[model samples]
Target: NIYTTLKFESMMQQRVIQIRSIPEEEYHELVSVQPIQVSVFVQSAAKVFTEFEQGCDTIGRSKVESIYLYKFNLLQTAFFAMVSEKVNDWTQLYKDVRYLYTENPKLLQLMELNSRRLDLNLNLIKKTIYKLVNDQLQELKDNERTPDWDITISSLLPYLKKTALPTLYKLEDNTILVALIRYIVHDLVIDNILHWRVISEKSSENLSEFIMLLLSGLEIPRLNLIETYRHSREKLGILSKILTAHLKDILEMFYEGEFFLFETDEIVQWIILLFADTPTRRDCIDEIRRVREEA
Candidate 1:
């Protein structure tokens, strides 16, 4: 165990330990800075582990039989365990969310949230929305090009008919739904004054909210590929360009590291917005709701 406690002082360069010049709490947080917090959290430890291991080897120390590098090598593990423990202190605060992970869902979700893998299914996203839009558009065409058409509740829920939306749903059970309340989106506007909007079908009752569904992958759907992709170019100006742009940045940032859930607010909202636009907020929840006063 000679190498176990050697020179912790110099190793203090890692956030694992506090600094002498700065206050404990302040220095502790500063040390958690990115490329270090998790990156360096593991990075700094690996540095210690390698340096310590190399030193041991050069000094003529060999592996203790069946053991790997100790102390320094285990440093990262110690750090992860300690923080994971601290994070759980407030998880019980979730009186509603039924967390169901066998592993540390919090840390896992944290990493998963920004994990370097958010293609946003853009390829699929664009194609899916494009297909539905055109298929709906073509459905009207197939029926002889009616001026006003109907895109049922099933229209927006195309994800139900298909699969492969990276984060949308699990394959074990992708039956999603039908399908209902599909009234109509007649008298549609092609060459309108400008942008079109979906009004509440309950022009009779009350309208104050909106909703659209979405996703999925591969195979056939009897779509005109080039035409639909071009339509995606037109309809998904927001998604294909604006929101997609943000998604790319965030996905990279997620991979880039040193970010948190709260920071992803805009990304989340934009996705909501992305769904709205792609699903043709033009129909389905075509029901519109106006801002009402207090009840």
Candidate 2:
């Protein structure tokens, strides 16, 4: 009771009052301040959702059939939620897409375009082979050859019959058929026989006999071992020699990350010079394409 009485006396001693005089009507401003207004009517949640869905749809539909089919489930659900107003706002929609699939739409779009390019280039290889074979066939008709050439074609007929070549010709272009013929002619004949001398004299008496031996399962053909290797290496050409002579500056640019400075036509010429003379050039080019895509 004493403490309460002392506290009350202290509070009463410290008590003070300050008064603010009310302004007169004449002195007061006539203008009134308005509350903040939202632009919700101009830019609603539904409108934002519509814009996002349209963007994704454009990315999805603009490309090939592969893009349309791949990851369709994720896209469908994303669009469904957006269209039906199931999502709250842009932030919520982004969070939903991110957390639901753990995927970025931009990354998806990039991968789609990359895949499209890969498929297109793959088909380009096939078409190029087809065109080469057509040109070669025309050349063959124009230029005459001996019995050896005739025998080679005749020998190839049986192998061709056993293969998809017959059915492939039903299509407008027989890419695989042409590729196989190219392989047999260049890889088997020139590289295997002439360049490296992989086969014996008896086995390779003529192109017909060579084809027969190959089809009948010929393993490691009779040849001088070390000399064969040397011959093959010679045929492939010395990489260092070629690089030092022709590709030194180009390779320096590549190492310094200035490859973009090289024109596309110049690169094409360089690629031809580097890989054109080899039997396995197609394989080399294929590996290069794979490496670039992976990078």
Candidate 3:
């Protein structure tokens, strides 16, 4: 693997010899200050992930989307990277990173970032140190920054040991995880609270095959209805609004609501727990009201 390793010592000496840069006094200033560690970066990044729990969306797939972050191409990026990394760009943090750990090191060296913001799989060095982390675990579809953990857990969790951390979660591992324990708990739907039974469990029931023939309703696409949300585009926070409503109705019918509960008594899990909605930790339960309302 061709990883870039710029240390305080070697890079310092090399600079004086080659460019005569980083004078002794400047070097003294650096050694005095605390350098940002790989661990600190993950915590900072996770803080941004919390935003996903609420006003953010899955793809956030538009130029004009408005949940704040994705709403613009202006100074927004600078502002966020500022609070998160204590710099204007994450790559700016890279200079402070001593900047090791990156993707595709095989014959690929010094993944440059001076020109743009680099997207590294992050799990490699964010917080935890995996004895053997692999790219195949991603199970990504098409190409997106976010990932799907359900399809990938075959290689997930098993790779983890407690790392003797407070929580079983390794923030390096856990930080990269889209779902914290909360997303699961929220989706679990507390069966005791809503233990409704299924009519068919009571006995095999007839369906709206009859009702469908009579009310055999059409489901028109809200193609234009979507025009009003998240800066009015597909894949914005708007999609979340649209999906939850449809998912609720479908889920209501799927479980038959309070009327026909399953004899097995299924729990009311999040329709899609993998993505960030419930995926974020701190706001999992808090966001439910809006999730229901927006849905």
Candidate 4:
């Protein structure tokens, strides 16, 4: 039965081929016979046709199969063929792939859009923090309410504390606060004191003395020697060089203070850098002792 069905389908296909190949003069006669022969052949092939149709239908219903079928479809096949023919022509309107880096207008536009979004987000966060701080300060002053300044202060105190500050510095992620500090400190110290020359030597010296006094009250160890070497200066020099580079990077990043760009990996790197430069070297020990004696 299967062989007979296959033979019949093949015979029908041969007839279609014959009709297509027929000369123009005799095409009408072949065409006239085709419909009648096709009808009979279809009727004879009905069982096989149903099986084939069901198989095709099952395949067509599936997403992957449907895509494949769609590609093979008359319209899509023609469309794709046309596309392939003019692909170079269409591509000519855009920059070449090799030159895309500098030439791609769309990419530049997208980058600008992203930069604006980042700026907007940063500004919003700054405004919110500023508002919150001012509101709390105003309420405290007006209401004479000591409504848990400790709690609010405590929230940020961890950031300022030695342990947390070191941890945060190690992480390098606190970009927003870091940026604000850079801004405030620059205005108070570098801009006001150094650049503007507004601060006198007496005031600067007094401020420095006050800072030293404040630092002296904090009993944190200045340094810990993790390892000692016979050539301690050489080893210290190498460590200092490496640590200075890392510290410079952290300082630069902190100076920028875009907290949104802070990464945990960067923070860890900073911590390691800080740990490397932990102990004060032998050369500085005398200076530290002199300062302590004077204090």
Candidate 5:
């Protein structure tokens, strides 16, 4: 919530300035530089999201939590920087691209990449903009950043876009692209790939119910085993559930067939397992405790 709020306020203020000052020439440049920027942002966001989700539970609430927060903040800052830089870059490139295009349409290929990037960037921007704005306002309220006597919703008018609704619709006009982006965004946020299916009445219970039932099945055995194992088994079970749930898709993707090789996937899996292993449990616990203290 704090992250969202700060992001929104910063974005809204920045967007207002951008929209108002951007000229037609600048728009052309933006169209040219946006694609690379968006691609970079998306990749970076995905990596950061994956890292955050994996480490979040283990990070706990302690002094070492600063590491998580620092990473999170860095991701946010990078995301914002990429967005701003690309926007500015496009604005600058627009004039040159326009001149080239006028002289020879073949030169438009130079702008093609940027144009695609712009489309992706705009769509992402649209999806996140409102969330950020609302978050910022909430943060401001909580922090009392502005004087209560002086603050008014009316003062925030500049932050609200008159054409936001139409612009969003226009940006997402390609249903397939919109859907793909949504899927990607969802995966990044949750660090899971979820697919839905319909089932008959007797086929099986819904996932939520099924998970509850499985946990229920474990409840008594876990309690009974705790005395003998000093709760180590119980902890293992819990950690296993988390690891399986989070890593299943990735594991499946990698091992579904033989001879599979993905460097990134392999590295991530190794890291995750290392962190989850009993040998590293104490270190993990200490780190989490540190984070909680710091936080």
Candidate 6:
């Protein structure tokens, strides 16, 4: 893969030159002065500040989104490079990092001022980092940053581990997770959840035929009534207002009982099962199936 290596290498090499610059006897003093790996962090921060000032606006706009997409990786690379070389130590790393701004008054001043101000140099950096993180997350919808761990583990957990069933699920492989939420309602529901001996035959008929008819009846009026009310050109009279108020009560009833309707019992579960399982879930499955088939 084409990845960012040079960006981190520069930070590592710059620290390398600093450690080598001090003479052998004086190196002990350098070690004493910076008990932790703060010097590497300082060197990188100094470089960031200097370069940011020269053309901060242009560089931040052009480079940050494209170049620093893998910033977390670069941060770790910069971190380990300094500590591994013995110029920095890990024992005091956490403690020393907290007090860095206190030692550098200029840095402390920038932090204090930037916290209140909106458009400071660090503010620009903050905005750029926010955009970069958001873009990284969006990229994962079409691509994973690495390993596919988040998608894979979450996808397989229900099927492989959990006893409670899932109507929605994802499938996985070594490299990528092909989320397969598009299974037949019969496969997940008709066979599995609604498998009572007396009711199995009736369940399939109700889910396939009766429920579909029921929702069409329930949905058709509310939709046509609202659309007629919305697009009517004539001034709505008091009677019209009363009729719309009645429609509003109907809608409120549906919304208020939405959970209770779907979740009250296994019998109600069958009713709600038909709610999304037939047309809506079918549509979802068809869309994904067509996309993969076309590919």
State the lDDT of candidate 4 residue by residue for 71-147, as single tens digits.
Answer: 22332223223323332322221112112213233234323433454455446544543444444333333333223
> Candidate 2 clashing pairs?
none
lDDT of each: 0.31, 0.35, 0.28, 0.33, 0.36, 0.32
TM-score of each: 0.22, 0.22, 0.19, 0.22, 0.20, 0.21
Which 10 residues in a row give candidate 3 its minimum summed lDDT? Answer: 201-210
Q: How close to the true structure is residue 125 of candidate 3, measured as C-alpha lDDT?
A: 28
lDDT of 6 by residue, 51-150 (tens): 3323323344344455443442343344334433543332233223333444544344343332333123224433443343233223332342231323
Q: Give candidate 4 regions above 4 Å deviation.
A: 1-106, 143-147, 154-178, 182-295
lDDT of the structure predicted as candidate 3: 0.28
Q: What lDDT is obtained when candidate 1 is compared to the true structure?
A: 0.31
Query: Candidate 2's error at 268, in angstroms?
Result: 29
Report clashes for each candidate as comma-separated counts. Answer: 10, 0, 9, 5, 26, 0
- Which is the better candidate, 4 or 5, if ranked by lDDT? 5
lDDT of 2 by residue, 2-60 (tens): 54445433422222110011123212222221232221221222233333444445334
lDDT of 4 at 95: 15
Lowest lDDT 10-mer window, candidate 2?
14-23
Q: Arrange candidates by lDDT, descending.
A: 5, 2, 4, 6, 1, 3
lDDT of 3 by residue, 1-295 (tens): 0111122223223322332221233221222223333433333233222332222233332411433332221222432334333443343344433232231121112223321342342433222322211232212222223444342234323333222222222223332232322221122212211222321211111111211211111111222233222122222222223223433453344333321222212212322321234434224333443344464
For 187-291, candidate 5 gives per-residue lDDT tens digits of 321122121122222211122232233233223232342343323333323323333343344333334431122233332433344344464544444443454
Count backbone overlaps in model 2: 0
Give candidate 5 misplaced runs (Cα > 4 Å).
1-105, 116-120, 123-165, 171-181, 189-295
What does candidate 3 score on TM?
0.19
Of 3 and 4, the candidate ahead on lDDT is: 4
